[PDB]
Amino acid sequence: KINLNQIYTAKEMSERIGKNRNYLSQAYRNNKHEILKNFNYRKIGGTIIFSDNPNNDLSQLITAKEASQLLGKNDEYFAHIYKRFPHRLEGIDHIYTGKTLFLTKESLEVFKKK
């Protein structure tokens, strides 16, 4: 099960490895695969997300907007709930980073059941 405490943007991950904040974003733009091959990352909507834990399956992450749409709701459905009624997402694994709220495929299923 994905550990959402180990999920960062490229800029934060670049600082976690002791590099300038643009290091991984520049590697991704310039196709520096000999660097990138060593990292667990994924493009998820408009954010390249990284984890320092190779066992986190980043394909389980989904944006709040995508989650909203898979429920047949307005794009801002989960965003609006998170902001005003954050306890509605108790027990729904989520993480906010890079100014973006993310759920998981499993936590969306939990929410649908709730």
Automatic annotation (TrEMBL):
One of the record's GO molecular function terms: isomerase activity
Highest taxon of the lineage: Bacteria
Keywords (A to Z) from UniProt: Isomerase, Plasmid
Keyword Isomerase listed: yes
Name of this protein: AM32
Organism this protein belongs to: Enterococcus faecalis
